[PDB]
Amino acid sequence: SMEQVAMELRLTELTRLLRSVLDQLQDKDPARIFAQPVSLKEVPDYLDHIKHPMDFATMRKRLEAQGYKNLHEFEEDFDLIIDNCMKYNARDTVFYRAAVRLRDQGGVVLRQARREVDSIG
Description:
This is Bromodomain-containing protein 1. It contains 5 helices and no strands. The chain is mainly α. It has a single domain, classed as Bromodomain-like (Histone Acetyltransferase, Chain A), CATH 1.20.920.10.
C-alpha cells in the first residue's frame, strides 16, 4: 500500500538521523572504550554482573537493520552502555570516568536530536 511505503520512508529517514546521532556520540568516546562488546573470553564472568550488555557496534547493527522504531529505543541502548559501565567498574577507573564524560557530552547531542525528531515528525 501507499501508507506502508510512506511509513517505510519515515523509518528510513529516522535511521538516517540516528546514524548521524550515533556518529556524534561515538566521537565522544575517542578512546574507543565502548566501541565493541565486552569480550567474554577476557571477562568470562561478565554476564553474571551485567544482564543486558551493549556497545556501539551492536547499536550500529541494529540501526542498519532499521531496528530502532523511535529515538526512545535508541536512547535506551545508549543508556545501557553508560549504565553497565558505571556498575561493573569502580569510580576510580578509566572505564567509569570515560562513561561519565560520554554521558555528559552525549546529553547535548541527544537534547537536540529529541527536538529534530519531534520537529520533523
